[PDB]
Amino acid sequence: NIEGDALNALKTNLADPNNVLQSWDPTLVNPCTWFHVTCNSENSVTRVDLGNANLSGQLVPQLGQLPNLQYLELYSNNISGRIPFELGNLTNLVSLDLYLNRLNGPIPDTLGKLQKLRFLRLNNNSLNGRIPMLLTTVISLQVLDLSNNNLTGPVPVNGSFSLFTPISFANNPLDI
Amino acid sequence: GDYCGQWDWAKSTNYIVYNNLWNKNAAASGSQCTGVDKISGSTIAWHTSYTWTGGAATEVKSYSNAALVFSKKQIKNIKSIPTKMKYSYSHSSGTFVADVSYDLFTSSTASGSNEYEIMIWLAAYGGAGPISSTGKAIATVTIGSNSFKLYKGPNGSTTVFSFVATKTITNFSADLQKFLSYLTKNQGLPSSQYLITLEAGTEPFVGTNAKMTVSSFSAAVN
Amino acid sequence: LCIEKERDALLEFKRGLSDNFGQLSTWGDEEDKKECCKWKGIECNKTTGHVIVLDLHNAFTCSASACFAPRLTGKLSPSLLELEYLNFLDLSVNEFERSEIPRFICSFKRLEYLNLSSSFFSGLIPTQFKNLTSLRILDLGYNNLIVKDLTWLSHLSSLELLSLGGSDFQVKNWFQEITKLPLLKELDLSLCGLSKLVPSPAEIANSSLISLSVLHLCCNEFSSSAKYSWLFNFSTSLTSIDLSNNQLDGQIDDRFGNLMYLEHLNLANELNLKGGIPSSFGNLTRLRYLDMSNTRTYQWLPELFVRLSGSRKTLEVLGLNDNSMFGSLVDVTRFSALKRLYLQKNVLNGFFMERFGQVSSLEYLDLSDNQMRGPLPDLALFPSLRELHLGSNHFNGRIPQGIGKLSQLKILDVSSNRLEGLPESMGQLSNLESFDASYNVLKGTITESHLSNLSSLVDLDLSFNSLALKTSIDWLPPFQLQVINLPSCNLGPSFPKWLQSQNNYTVLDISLANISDALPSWFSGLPPDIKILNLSNNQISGRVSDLIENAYDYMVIDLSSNNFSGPLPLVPTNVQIFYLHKNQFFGSISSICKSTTGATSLDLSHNQFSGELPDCWMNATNLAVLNLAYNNFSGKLPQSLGSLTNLEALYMRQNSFSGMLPSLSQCQSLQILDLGGNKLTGRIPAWIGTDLLNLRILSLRFNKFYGSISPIICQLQFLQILDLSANGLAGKIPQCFNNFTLLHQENGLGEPMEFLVQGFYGKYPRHYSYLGNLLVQWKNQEAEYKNPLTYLKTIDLSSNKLVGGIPKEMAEMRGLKSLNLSRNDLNGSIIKGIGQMKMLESLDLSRNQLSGMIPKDLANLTFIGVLDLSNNHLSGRIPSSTQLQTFERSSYSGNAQLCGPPLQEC
Ligand SMILES: *[C@@H]1O[C@H](CO)[C@@H](O[C@@H]2O[C@H](CO)[C@@H](O[C@@H]3O[C@H](CO[C@H]4O[C@H](CO[C@H]5O[C@H](CO)[C@@H](O)[C@H](O)[C@@H]5O[C@H]5O[C@H](CO)[C@@H](O)[C@H](O)[C@@H]5O)[C@@H](O)[C@H](O[C@H]5O[C@H](CO)[C@@H](O)[C@H](O)[C@@H]5O)[C@@H]4O)[C@@H](O)[C@H](O[C@H]4O[C@H](CO)[C@@H](O)[C@H](O)[C@@H]4O)[C@@H]3O)[C@H](O)[C@H]2NC(C)=O)[C@H](O)[C@H]1NC(C)=O
Ligand SMILES: *[C@@H]1O[C@H](CO)[C@@H](O[C@@H]2O[C@H](CO)[C@@H](O[C@@H]3O[C@H](CO[C@H]4O[C@H](CO)[C@@H](O)[C@H](O)[C@@H]4O)[C@@H](O)[C@H](O[C@H]4O[C@H](CO)[C@@H](O)[C@H](O)[C@@H]4O)[C@@H]3O)[C@H](O)[C@H]2NC(C)=O)[C@H](O)[C@H]1NC(C)=O
Ligand SMILES: *[C@@H]1O[C@H](CO)[C@@H](O[C@@H]2O[C@H](CO)[C@@H](O[C@@H]3O[C@H](CO)[C@@H](O)[C@H](O)[C@@H]3O)[C@H](O)[C@H]2NC(C)=O)[C@H](O)[C@H]1NC(C)=O
Ligand SMILES: *[C@@H]1O[C@H](CO)[C@@H](O[C@@H]2O[C@H](CO)[C@@H](O[C@@H]3O[C@H](CO)[C@@H](O)[C@H](O)[C@@H]3O)[C@H](O)[C@H]2NC(C)=O)[C@H](O)[C@H]1NC(C)=O
Ligand SMILES: *[C@@H]1O[C@H](CO)[C@@H](O[C@@H]2O[C@H](CO)[C@@H](O[C@@H]3O[C@H](CO)[C@@H](O)[C@H](O)[C@@H]3O)[C@H](O)[C@H]2NC(C)=O)[C@H](O)[C@H]1NC(C)=O
Ligand SMILES: *[C@@H]1O[C@H](CO)[C@@H](O[C@@H]2O[C@H](CO)[C@@H](O[C@@H]3O[C@H](CO)[C@@H](O)[C@H](O)[C@@H]3O)[C@H](O)[C@H]2NC(C)=O)[C@H](O)[C@H]1NC(C)=O
Ligand SMILES: *[C@@H]1O[C@H](CO)[C@@H](O[C@@H]2O[C@H](CO)[C@@H](O[C@@H]3O[C@H](CO)[C@@H](O)[C@H](O)[C@@H]3O)[C@H](O)[C@H]2NC(C)=O)[C@H](O)[C@H]1NC(C)=O
Ligand SMILES: *[C@@H]1O[C@H](CO)[C@@H](O[C@@H]2O[C@H](CO)[C@@H](O)[C@H](O)[C@H]2NC(C)=O)[C@H](O)[C@H]1NC(C)=O
Ligand SMILES: *[C@@H]1O[C@H](CO)[C@@H](O[C@@H]2O[C@H](CO)[C@@H](O)[C@H](O)[C@H]2NC(C)=O)[C@H](O)[C@H]1NC(C)=O
Ligand SMILES: *[C@@H]1O[C@H](CO)[C@@H](O)[C@H](O)[C@H]1NC(C)=O
Ligand SMILES: *[C@@H]1O[C@H](CO)[C@@H](O)[C@H](O)[C@H]1NC(C)=O
Numbered sequence A: 001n002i003e004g005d006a007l008n009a010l011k012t013n014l015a016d017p018n019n020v021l022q023s024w025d026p027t028l029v030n031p032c033t034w035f036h037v038t039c040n041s042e043n044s045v046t047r048v049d050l051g052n053a054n055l056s057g058q059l060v061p062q063l064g065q066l067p068n069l070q071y072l073e074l075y076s077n078n079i080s081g082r083i084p085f086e087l088g089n090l091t092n093l094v095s096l097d098l099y100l101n102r103l104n105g106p107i108p109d110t111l112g113k114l115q116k117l118r119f120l121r122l123n124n125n126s127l128n129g130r131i132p133m134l135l136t137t138v139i140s141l142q143v144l145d146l147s148n149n150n151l152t153g154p155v156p157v158n159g160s161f162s163l164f165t166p167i168s169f170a171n172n173p174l175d176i
Numbered sequence B: 001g002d003y004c005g006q007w008d009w010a011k012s013t014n015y016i017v018y019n020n021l022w023n024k025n026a027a028a029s030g031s032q033c034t035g036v037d038k039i040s041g042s043t044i045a046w047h048t049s050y051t052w053t054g055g056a057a058t059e060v061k062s063y064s065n066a067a068l069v070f071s072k073k074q075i076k077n078i079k080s081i082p083t084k085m086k087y088s089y090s091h092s093s094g095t096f097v098a099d100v101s102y103d104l105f106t107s108s109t110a111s112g113s114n115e116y117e118i119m120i121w122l123a124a125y126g127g128a129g130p131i132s133s134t135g136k137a138i139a140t141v142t143i144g145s146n147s148f149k150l151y152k153g154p155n156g157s158t159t160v161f162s163f164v165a166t167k168t169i170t171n172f173s174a175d176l177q178k179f180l181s182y183l184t185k186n187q188g189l190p191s192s193q194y195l196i197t198l199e200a201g202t203e204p205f206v207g208t209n210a211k212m213t214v215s216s217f218s219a220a221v222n
Numbered sequence C: 001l002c003i004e005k006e007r008d009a010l011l012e013f014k015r016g017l018s019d020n021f022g023q024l025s026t027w028g029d030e031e032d033k034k035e036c037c038k039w040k041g042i043e044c045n046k047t048t049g050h051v052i053v054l055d056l057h058n059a060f061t062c063s064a065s066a067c068f069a070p071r072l073t074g075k076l077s078p079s080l081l082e083l084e085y086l087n088f089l090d091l092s093v094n095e096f097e098r099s100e101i102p103r104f105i106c107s108f109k110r111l112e113y114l115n116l117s118s119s120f121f122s123g124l125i126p127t128q129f130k131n132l133t134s135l136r137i138l139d140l141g142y143n144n145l146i147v148k149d150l151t152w153l154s155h156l157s158s159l160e161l162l163s164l165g166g167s168d169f170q171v172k173n174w175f176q177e178i179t180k181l182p183l184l185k186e187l188d189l190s191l192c193g194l195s196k197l198v199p200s201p202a203e204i205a206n207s208s209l210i211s212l213s214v215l216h217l218c219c220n221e222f223s224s225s226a227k228y229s230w231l232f233n234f235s236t237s238l239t240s241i242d243l244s245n246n247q248l249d250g251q252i253d254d255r256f257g258n259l260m261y262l263e264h265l266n267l268a269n270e271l272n273l274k275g276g277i278p279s280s281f282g283n284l285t286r287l288r289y290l291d292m293s294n295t296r297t298y299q300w301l302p303e304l305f306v307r308l309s310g311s312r313k314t315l316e317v318l319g320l321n322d323n324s325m326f327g328s329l330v331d332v333t334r335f336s337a338l339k340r341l342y343l344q345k346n347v348l349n350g351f352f353m354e355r356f357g358q359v360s361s362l363e364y365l366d367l368s369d370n371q372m373r374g375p376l377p378d379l380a381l382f383p384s385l386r387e388l389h390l391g392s393n394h395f396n397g398r399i400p401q402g403i404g405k406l407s408q409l410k411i412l413d414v415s416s417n418r419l420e421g422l423p424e425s426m427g428q429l430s431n432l433e434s435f436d437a438s439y440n441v442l443k444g445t446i447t448e449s450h451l452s453n454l455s456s457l458v459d460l461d462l463s464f465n466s467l468a469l470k471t472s473i474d475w476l477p478p479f480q481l482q483v484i485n486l487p488s489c490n491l492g493p494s495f496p497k498w499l500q501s502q503n504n505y506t507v508l509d510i511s512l513a514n515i516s517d518a519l520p521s522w523f524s525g526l527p528p529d530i531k532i533l534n535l536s537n538n539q540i541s542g543r544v545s546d547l548i549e550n551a552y553d554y555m556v557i558d559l560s561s562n563n564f565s566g567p568l569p570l571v572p573t574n575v576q577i578f579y580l581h582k583n584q585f586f587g588s589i590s591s592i593c594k595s596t597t598g599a600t601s602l603d604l605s606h607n608q609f610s611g612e613l614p615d616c617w618m619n620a621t622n623l624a625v626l627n628l629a630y631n632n633f634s635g636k637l638p639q640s641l642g643s644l645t646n647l648e649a650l651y652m653r654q655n656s657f658s659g660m661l662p663s664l665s666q667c668q669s670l671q672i673l674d675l676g677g678n679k680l681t682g683r684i685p686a687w688i689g690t691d692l693l694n695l696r697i698l699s700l701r702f703n704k705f706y707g708s709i710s711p712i713i714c715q716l717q718f719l720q721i722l723d724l725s726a727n728g729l730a731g732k733i734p735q736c737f738n739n740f741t742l743l744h745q746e747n748g749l750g751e752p753m754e755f756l757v758q759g760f761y762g763k764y765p766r767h768y769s770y771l772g773n774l775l776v777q778w779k780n781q782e783a784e785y786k787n788p789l790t791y792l793k794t795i796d797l798s799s800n801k802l803v804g805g806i807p808k809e810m811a812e813m814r815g816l817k818s819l820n821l822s823r824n825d826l827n828g829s830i831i832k833g834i835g836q837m838k839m840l841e842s843l844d845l846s847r848n849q850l851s852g853m854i855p856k857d858l859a860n861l862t863f864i865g866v867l868d869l870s871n872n873h874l875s876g877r878i879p880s881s882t883q884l885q886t887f888e889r890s891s892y893s894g895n896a897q898l899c900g901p902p903l904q905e906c
């Protein structure tokens, strides 16, 4: 009921114009039968798939209370807010794609705590800050894209960032 | 054929014919049985036999009716409700009180508790009368060459309007939209209400070897 | 006393009249009934013996939705003229021969009272009534009379009370004729056509002066103040005015103020008063009754109270319900003589405070259906309250401790509020009959002290709170409850002990309690006239085959979700809801046949009933839903199941049936047909598509169904769940799948299933919602979807040896939210158009024999959550998309020629 409570907290804070969140109800023992939520064995949430679903709102601090989550997809939605620091508690996240969306703030350093992340797409967003230093400490990150964002500071290349291209960091106020 | 249960019915296409002995226990040594005879398109024909005696001789004992299933539409979206009903009746001995009535039930939503009820009394025998807060009519309405007196009353949380004819009408043919429009314009019935149910049938109080035959009954909602 | 000729005349009068209800039973010629004066309705002079009063009138006794009056039918005999000293005659509610008013009444010569009102007289008033010179009270109201000339009223010069309402009034100059009666004090002219008959000012100018006190002008389509203005000529002497049901659309005329001696105003049932009380009031100083119900005033309540401040010491009844009035009820105590205050169904969004300490004389207070906030006032300031309705408001806080100072309360309705607690002094009321405190957030425990002295309580309603009810052992309840609605109340770990003394109750709903005890020995016989039994969602254990005894008035039995064990209990002959699921019953259910029943919804699921299903279902033809799932029944399905014409939901799954399936042809209005498991054999029934046309869910999975899916199944037009997985089918998938409407709508929620329990609120029925489950193969897990009708839209034909190609007609199926066509010998290519399926969250085409390359349109999904195309003979490159690249290598493996970013590279 803890994961269902977290997902319900996510639901209440956001507003749905197309009404694609109507099937999320707390009475069920698990949120497994909910739409746009993918299950696994033993009924733990492992995917949250919401693409061009027109959702508007802000992110929820207790979103990270899901331990066995992977592939958190929330791109192309009208979500205005700040990336929570609790996302670092995800010990199994793989793909975090939040692009074509309007989130303001910096990229948390705790996000670099992900030791199994492979995909990170934050494009066409307006985030004010600099690239985290600790994010390069993960060696499983195969692709990254931080473009068309309010990015300033230095461009890190050492370590896992040595296999990337400047295109991943483009259209920014300061790149040097 | 002919069935005698308290809640049994003979369902057909677009019509459901009930027995509805909802106040059976208020009478002593009575019985009632209804049956659908012939079906022809939208036309129906049924009959009801009963005998009720004693007990609370001032209360309705049953409402064996012939209800119609339709799309739950708001009053303002209803164009016409053409209805025709021809019936004959036969009682035997005496101390006879009964009634032939149309019921319309309307509520705020398409599936909810009734908030407005509409009686149309086509015949009143033995002093049976509609429910009224004051016991006196509040309007006189002539619709389709047929006089009517209007009564208003409470029933729990429901408001019951009643159009009682001045002469017994054994052959009726009219439009219920006229009554509904009169109620909406004059008596203050909201036009956004959802017409839940339409039905027509007998409503006995006391009788002995009693039988009502509906030679024809048709209705529709447009 | 009792002159012989008078008695003979009375007997001859009775002879014509036909009495059927015991009236005139005292009247007779038997020697024991010789005395005239002792008869019912006859009064005689004391000195002489002549009859002075003859009142054979009745009254309307009313029931649920009909009133009845014991009318006297017959012919009015002319022998009444022998009663030459009669002065009081009253024949009011009787309906005699519905004909003219008899003319002989003109020659009584001493009548001082006549009342033929509410009979069924018709036609013109006889012209001979000019001989009734001694008449003081005339009442001919509410008959089918036609009054077109009033030239006879001139002679009746002793009248003080004239009533001609309900007539076809066509007198053009009625004011001129009425003004000729010098002693008239009231005048009833209701329901006439007074809208079209207004007196010209010249007529008022040329008229004799008379002083009226009561005007009954109702049911006249005035619709304006320009048509009832004439009554203001009587402003000096008016006391009572009645103007209800006139379609008044405008401000109340300011001349209603400055009507001195006015004591009774009735302006109910208008069109729109547009503001309500004018500022002209406050000059009244003598008001005692004001009614404005159902008028759409839109007035501020404190402003109304200030404008009625001229008559605080006299005002007694104030009806302001069914309007739209806002504000708060502040200082109601300043109205000293107030006794009724009806403020129902308003828009009152304020508080209820006294803020000054005086006692109130209120006896009936009504505040239901509002938006009032804040705590309740000190109820000890209303010691004479007989009824208190405060439901559907937003009151909060504990009920005040002074509630026990009333000692006259009979009804207490505080339901649907945000109340917080119950006081201890509630038990000293000693006159309460109903207690509706349901759907509040109530907390604490109700001990015996809360119920110590309620000797007249009949209804107890504490539904759905956080409340607890712990009564000590050796407590004898001082009441005998008739309805016991205590759901979601902690009634103790053991079975409640105070039900031992409770007989004579009609409903008993103690579900959602915490009773974890065996069924007690004493709890063997329910009251003989019990209606609703609901012991559901507890942990009660024992044998209940000895608890149901075919009471004539059973309507609901709900023993679901418990620890009951034993044989199937008796099915009462008039029960409609028979729920027994999630228990431990075992045995055969052949006892569901021997008696005809009115059951419409029975649930026997999740039990241990065994044996072959009986062939007796013609004795139960009122069924709407039938649940025989998750048991170990066996054998063929009975043929009698085809006689369930009213059936709309058949839940027969997770059993061990066998054989072919019976002809459920004449079972129209069937929406759900679930037959999972059950080892059924045979070809797919050809009558499913031919006859069943309202079907929405068709679950024939984990069976032995050889053959082919005939295209007739496309004629269903309403299917949203099709599931034939693991059935051993064959043939090609039909190309006719376009015809399934509701699978093209992008976002459409189907209505839930609803059956009808008739007779709940007396004449009125109740609608029950059955949200049945459905076992589906959802996202690689076998899951029990809760309400499949509203949301789910799936097609599943996996593991059924289907040979052919995927039809190209599935492209435009926007609403499909799952697709499983795996483990079949299909060949071809993925149809170009799957990318058009916007809300498809589950795709599975694995273990087929497909070919070609993946279509590019799959990049448009953006909602797909589970994909599996393994072992399918594809080639080419996987389309690039955010969702496609987020899938494991296992989802695309098994293809010897496919290569993409997920696996290897070209
Ligand atoms: C010629 O003969 C004819 C005979 O046909 C005479 O006509 C008869 O005259 C008698 C008078 O002797 C009449 O009897 C009297 O009736 C009145 C009215 O009773 C009805 O109304 C009461 C109040 O109703 C309002 O309030 C209630 C809630 O309190 C509400 O439910 C109602 O709907 C109504 O509400 C309206 O008003 C509210 C306040 O403003 C508004 O808020 C609201 O929105 C509405 O606008 C009501 O209490 C009463 O209830 C009784 O009846 C029902 C149904 O049968 C029953 O269920 C109840 O249990 C009650 O029994 C009625 O509905 C009544 O007030 C009189 O009471 C006197 O007698 C009793 C006897 O015990 C005393 O205790 C009283 O103190 C009081 O003295 C009396 O009964 C009769 O109705 C009338 N009949 C006809 C057909 O006209 C005629 O008078 C004769 N001619 C002459 C010249 O005399
Ligand atoms: C035997 O007794 C049992 C238990 O006492 C009965 O089962 C209960 O029946 C009641 C009445 O139908 C159920 O109450 C209803 O629950 C609905 C579902 O609630 C969930 O969903 C809503 C909406 O998403 C949430 O807000 C809520 O928190 C829950 O998560 C409600 O939607 C209903 O509300 C409607 O009615 C109330 C009261 O009239 C209104 O105030 C509302 O505005 C709304 O209109 C309602 O509360 C209850 O859930 C059942 N419990 C169980 C365990 O099943 C049996 O019905 C009874 N037997 C028979 C034959 O009646
Ligand atoms: C790749 O390069 C980045 C910088 O370009 C490295 O980040 C830096 O890592 C060093 C550790 O080698 C950090 O130094 C530490 O700083 C903390 C205070 O923040 C101090 O307490 C420690 O004693 C230590 O000095 C440094 O802060 C950090 N950031 C910056 C801006 O220099 C990153 O570690 C490199 N990754 C590798 C080499 O794998
Ligand atoms: C029952 O019958 C008796 C007798 O007929 C009635 O008594 C009569 O009442 C009237 C009215 O009061 C009396 O008339 C008055 O008489 C006095 C004295 O004679 C006279 O001064 C007055 O001018 C007026 O005429 C009449 O005398 C009296 N009868 C007798 C014999 O004294 C009585 O009223 C009847 N009861 C009812 C209820 O009608
Ligand atoms: C369907 O319901 C009907 C009626 O509810 C059942 O018929 C009833 O069957 C019982 C058992 O055989 C009969 O009771 C016996 O009647 C005989 C003859 O009167 C009597 O000698 C026995 O001592 C015993 O009382 C009962 O009379 C009979 N009622 C009617 C109206 O026929 C029927 O068995 C149920 N099942 C099927 C499949 O029809
Ligand atoms: C698509 O679904 C519709 C139903 O919505 C199917 O239309 C149905 O077609 C049958 C053909 O056998 C019609 O039955 C016929 O009825 C007439 C009049 O009762 C009768 O004289 C014929 O002998 C025959 O029984 C049925 O009425 C009709 N239903 C509707 C609502 O039109 C259609 O066949 C399905 N398949 C397609 C369009 O490919
Ligand atoms: C579509 O329906 C088919 C069956 O009609 C579903 O196939 C099921 O797939 C799961 C996962 O591949 C199988 O679980 C397997 O269990 C064995 C142990 O028994 C394990 O060794 C495997 O690794 C795998 O986890 C399951 O047996 C299989 N059902 C069968 C064969 O009857 C399929 O999941 C459905 N597709 C979707 C998207 O729901
Ligand atoms: C209530 O009655 C008083 C009289 O008792 C009304 O006052 C009259 O009108 C004006 C007031 O501005 C003055 O000429 C006198 O006070 C009164 N005139 C007379 C007696 O001829 C007062 O207007 C009434 N209330 C309302 C709201 O009209
Ligand atoms: C229950 O109510 C009855 C009312 O009839 C109480 O009887 C009397 O109550 C008064 C005060 O309310 C006492 O002064 C009397 O002594 C009571 N009479 C008797 C014989 O005791 C009764 O006391 C109430 N119950 C309890 C437990 O107090
Ligand atoms: C929802 O999203 C679609 C894009 O598929 C867009 O066309 C539509 O305008 C959106 N609705 C609202 C209310 O913004
Ligand atoms: C919602 O999202 C659409 C998609 O691009 C965007 O055009 C629109 O401006 C957004 N609405 C807002 C931010 O209010």
Ligand SMILES: *[C@@H]1O[C@H](CO)[C@@H](O)[C@H](O)[C@H]1NC(C)=O
Binding pocket: A064, A085, A086, A087, A088, A089, A110
């Ligand atoms: C979750 O993240 C927050 C934010 O940094 C952190 O304080 C908390 O300790 C984390 N939870 C656990 C169990 O470590």
Ligand SMILES: *[C@@H]1O[C@H](CO)[C@@H](O)[C@H](O)[C@H]1NC(C)=O
Binding pocket: A100, A123, A124, A148
């Ligand atoms: C980001 O915005 C630019 C224009 O500001 C647009 O050309 C580009 O297509 C956007 N990114 C995506 C992924 O659509």
Ligand SMILES: *[C@@H]1O[C@H](CO)[C@@H](O)[C@H](O)[C@H]1NC(C)=O
Binding pocket: C106, C107, C128, C130, C131
């Ligand atoms: C009515 O009064 C007149 C005047 O005395 C009288 O001549 C006539 O006979 C009376 N009518 C009847 C029917 O008595």
Ligand SMILES: *[C@@H]1O[C@H](CO)[C@@H](O)[C@H](O)[C@H]1NC(C)=O
Binding pocket: C206
């Ligand atoms: C006006 O009043 C006088 C008073 O006697 C009366 O004679 C005359 O008939 C009245 N006018 C009319 C038109 O009736």
Ligand SMILES: *[C@@H]1O[C@H](CO)[C@@H](O)[C@H](O)[C@H]1NC(C)=O
Binding pocket: C204, C205, C232, C233
């Ligand atoms: C009656 O009222 C009208 C209107 O106010 C007035 O003109 C007329 O003088 C009044 N007549 C009497 C006799 O009071």
Ligand SMILES: *[C@@H]1O[C@H](CO)[C@@H](O)[C@H](O)[C@H]1NC(C)=O
Binding pocket: C480, C482, C504
């Ligand atoms: C039993 O209940 C009935 C209502 O059905 C009631 O009239 C009667 O007074 C009650 N008797 C007792 C002793 O409680």
Ligand SMILES: *[C@@H]1O[C@H](CO)[C@@H](O)[C@H](O)[C@H]1NC(C)=O
Binding pocket: C490, C493, C513, C514
């Ligand atoms: C009552 O039962 C509920 C669940 O049925 C449980 O959570 C609660 O602790 C129980 N309370 C007591 C006092 O037994």
Ligand SMILES: *[C@@H]1O[C@H](CO)[C@@H](O)[C@H](O)[C@H]1NC(C)=O
Binding pocket: C516, C539, C541, C562, C563
């Ligand atoms: C009632 O049944 C449930 C599950 O069937 C079980 O866990 C529980 O122990 C049972 N109650 C008792 C008192 O054993």
Ligand SMILES: *[C@@H]1O[C@H](CO)[C@@H](O)[C@H](O)[C@H]1NC(C)=O
Binding pocket: C607, C608, C610, C631, C632
């Ligand atoms: C039903 O009967 C079979 C065979 O006797 C048994 O295996 C099964 O356990 C029974 N069902 C239940 C729920 O015990």
Ligand SMILES: *[C@@H]1O[C@H](CO)[C@@H](O)[C@H](O)[C@H]1NC(C)=O
Binding pocket: C803, C804, C827, C828
């Ligand atoms: C698919 O299988 C059928 C069954 O043998 C075969 O006739 C057909 O030719 C196959 N499809 C193709 C494209 O060869």
Ligand SMILES: *[C@@H]1O[C@H](CO)[C@@H](O)[C@H](O)[C@H]1NC(C)=O
Binding pocket: C835, C856, C857, C859, C860
């Ligand atoms: C659907 O896919 C086609 C082919 O790739 C593409 O041209 C089209 O833009 C897509 N639809 C949307 C709404 O992007």
